[PDB]
Amino acid sequence: TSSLQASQDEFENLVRNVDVKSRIMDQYADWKGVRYRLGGSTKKGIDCSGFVQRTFREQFGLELPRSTYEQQEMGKSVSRSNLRTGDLVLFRAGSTGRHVGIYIGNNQFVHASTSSGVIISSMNEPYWKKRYNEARRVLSRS
């Protein structure tokens, strides 16, 4: 009831997705502290949606659309209780209407906020906990 318990398919899935957090953190390390800029796709200034697009394209090869609204309809919806790393977390920011980030585990998500640029933030923070919307999964590979 230890290791053998997990089936062979589950084992392959674990080996194939064990580095997802590591890749997102690679992107974060190369990209942490970059300023926030609306409609920006460069290290000179980037927005949440552009950061999500570049991250999912450069770390996984998934070419998501550009706007947060289009990304919000991408992939398949997921519930709060069972959300994995690499899923898209959507907040009702309202500065442009919506906000997109990348969940990394332990109620944490990487995102390019308008206040402090691209950073890690907590789902349990009062601002984000109060202003949570939906969540979408796009890394379909299992």
Partner: protein
């Protein structure tokens, strides 16, 4: 061509069949909810079941041969687990040769009156009967069935000269098609005997039947779609696929048909009198194939031309994907007609029952009439629309572990009150659906007590990974469906024997029907596990007096409910002497005229009630659609009064 008994070929078991049986046997013996063993007793019961399957009506059976082969009625277990189905094939071959011995004299004689109907009787339940000992009695009795059929055809039917010669042709071609059965029939018959002896829902599917189940669970027909029916070596292309891509090439129609055709460049094998399964298998093809299409005069004509037509993924669907949620009438009260719990039923109904969450909801209805259960994951994904993330069904294996299946993706999208209408011939997944809504108290149960199925089956292929590599000459192998788990409601109870007792009883349901799970062989017992955790919305399931007496008023205030109660009284009167029916042409013509006069009287009463002109003769009115269902109208009235309450019961 056609000759005598020697012409009947000696059937032999096919190469892969052995292995197939073995695997099947293995599964059935090792992994099945019923803890049984393939002992001598079970082998004998398999022998008896296979005998009853060979001829259900106890027509052509022979005590001598039965006892000759009842010597090895203990070895059937070794036969199954060894793959050498020798006894089954030998017994089937002897039955085929004895088919000729069944009778000979009557044929073509279809008009000349040879026998009179002087207060004779005939059994309608011919299952319980001893094995015939002599020969003369059955040789004489066989003609009675076809002679009574032709006498009733003189009572009601078509003209004599047109249909009689075709009926004689049908009988000769029936004798012909009986001598054209393949080994797959015998194999599947034996496997079905075994499975049904185990459990009524356990079954084996031949490769043809495996493709049938796959399409019935995918709708992705691979070939050319067309619903067909045959009459004497010619099938009639009804081709109701209309909007079908192979139907876009409707250059041929119902009368522009041919027999011999090829597939994607194969030699045009002139099929002349082949089996329906054979010609349908020849008509099918993979995704991305071709088909030979011949051009002929649109009607009767002998002038063939050759062209091509394409094959691709074709999805024939008798579904209505229509999404018109409008506030019309008094409330948005709709009826949802479900033909089956398809794997794609959630993927096509989510277009229907999703987009109304923020807007105003209403009392809509879901009708599960004549339903067939397809998938359990789909049943839970469809039942999660009306219940905000909750256990829909509990499953229990032979060990004792209980698991509650619920898709943890999505809240109650349709926040409106709901009425479920269900009949007695409903699917098991439909029972799960209705039981979930009844235990949650969110919907209202209306209709007839269901069939009462409480067993979960597993559908598995019989293919190993090494089959393709080292046995390339083998064909596709069958599949199996064996009961692995038993399902229960969240209230703790089950529907394996007691079914679901609805809050709104219907008149046609009050009769004691001789159908259901009880009259099925080897049906499992009843057991109630402890109740699950679930939030019940008001204890209105046991206390429904508000709409109960209202709808009793409604059923006592209309003559349709009364005429239907008269029909069920006729049923309750006839079912006393239902098993043995008496055939006197005088009293039979009397009852036929009585039924025709009663139908004409009821039609004139409803015409006077509705203001439509009265019918006088049966010739002007063609075959059309009769009244669909007054119980759906009572469900709409129930939904109306439910919206009345919700307007008067927010406090």
């Amino acid at each position: 061509d056609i000759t005598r008994a020697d012409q009947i070929p000696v059937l032999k078991e096919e190469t892969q069949h052995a292995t197939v049986s073995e695997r099947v046997t293995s599964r059935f013996t090792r992994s099945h909810y019923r803890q049984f063993d393939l002992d001598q007793a079970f082998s004998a019961k398999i022998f008896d079941r296979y005998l009853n399957l060979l001829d259900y009506s106890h027509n052509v059976l022979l005590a001598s041969d039965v006892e000759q082969f009842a010597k090895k009625k203990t070895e059937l277990g070794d036969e199954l687990r060894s793959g050498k189905l020798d006894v089954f094939y030998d017994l089937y071959n002897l039955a085929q040769k004895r088919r000729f011995e069944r009778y000979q004299y009557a044929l073509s004689v279809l008009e000349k009156p040879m026998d009179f109907t002087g207060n004779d009787t005939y059994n309608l339940d011919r299952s319980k009967a001893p094995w015939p000992k002599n020969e003369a009695e059955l040789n004489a009795l066989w003609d009675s069935k076809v002679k009574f059929d032709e006498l009733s055809l003189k009572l009601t039917g078509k003209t004599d000269k047109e249909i009689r010669e075709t009926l004689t042709r049908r009988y000769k071609f029936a004798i012909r098609r009986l001598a054209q059965t393949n080994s797959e029939d015998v194999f599947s018959l034996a496997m079905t005997a075994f499975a049904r002896e185990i459990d009524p829902h356990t079954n084996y599917l031949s490769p043809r039947n495996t493709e049938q189940f796959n399409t019935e669970m995918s709708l992705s027909l691979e070939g050319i779609g067309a619903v067909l029916q045959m009459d004497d070596d010619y099938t009639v292309i009804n081709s109701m696929v209309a909007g079908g891509p192979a139907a876009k090439s409707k250059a041929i129609s119902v009368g522009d048909k041919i027999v011999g055709v090829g597939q994607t460049g194969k030699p045009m094998v002139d099929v002349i009198g082949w089996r329906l399964d054979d010609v349908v298998a020849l008509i099918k093809g993979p995704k991305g194939s071709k088909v030979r299409l011949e051009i002929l005069p649109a009607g009767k004509g002998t002038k063939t031309r050759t062209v091509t037509l394409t094959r691709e993924r074709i999805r024939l669907e008798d579904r209505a994907v229509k999404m018109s949620v409008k506030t019309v009438g008094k409330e948005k009260v709709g009826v949802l007609d479900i033909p089956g719990f398809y794997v794609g039923l959630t993927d096509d109904v989510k277009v229907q029952l999703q987009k109304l969450e923020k807007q105003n909801v209403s009392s809509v209805i879901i009708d599960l009439r004549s339903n067939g259960g397809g998938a359990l994951t789909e049943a839970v994904s469809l039942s999660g629309l009306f219940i905000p993330a909750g256990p829909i069904v509990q499953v229990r294996d032979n060990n004792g572990k209980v698991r509650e299946d619920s898709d943890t993706d999505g809240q109650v999208f349709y926040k409106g009150p709901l009425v479920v209408l269900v009949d007695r011939f409903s699917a098991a997944a439909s029972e799960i659906f209705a039981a979930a809504m009844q235990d949650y108290g969110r919907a209202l149960v209306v209709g007839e007590p269901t069939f009462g199925a409480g067993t979960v089956q597993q559908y598995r292929s019989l293919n190993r990974i090494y089959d393709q590599m080292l046995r390339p000459e083998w064909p596709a192998l069958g599949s199996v469906q064996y009961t692995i788990q038993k399902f229960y409601r969240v209230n703790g109870g089950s529907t394996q024997r007691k079914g679901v007792t609805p809050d709104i009883i219907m008149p046609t349901g009050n009769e004691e029907t001789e159908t259901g799970e009880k009259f099925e062989d080897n049906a499992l017992p009843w057991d109630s596990i402890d109740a699950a955790t679930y939030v019940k919305s008001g204890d209105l399931t046991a206390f429904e007096p508000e709409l109960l007496k209202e709808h009793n008023a409604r059923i006592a205030k209309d003559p349709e409910f009364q005429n239907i109660m008269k029909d069920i009284a006729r049923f309750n009167a006839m079912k006393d002497k239902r098993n043995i029916v008496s055939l006197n042409y005088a009293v039979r013509e009397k009852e036929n005229n009585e039924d025709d006069a009663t139908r004409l009287a009821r039609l004139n009463e409803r015409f006077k009630r509705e203001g439509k002109p009265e019918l006088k003769k049966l010739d002007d009115l063609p075959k059309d659609y009769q009244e669909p269902d007054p119980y759906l109208d009572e469900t709409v009235n129930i939904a109306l009064d439910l919206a009345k309450l919700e307007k008067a019961r927010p406090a």
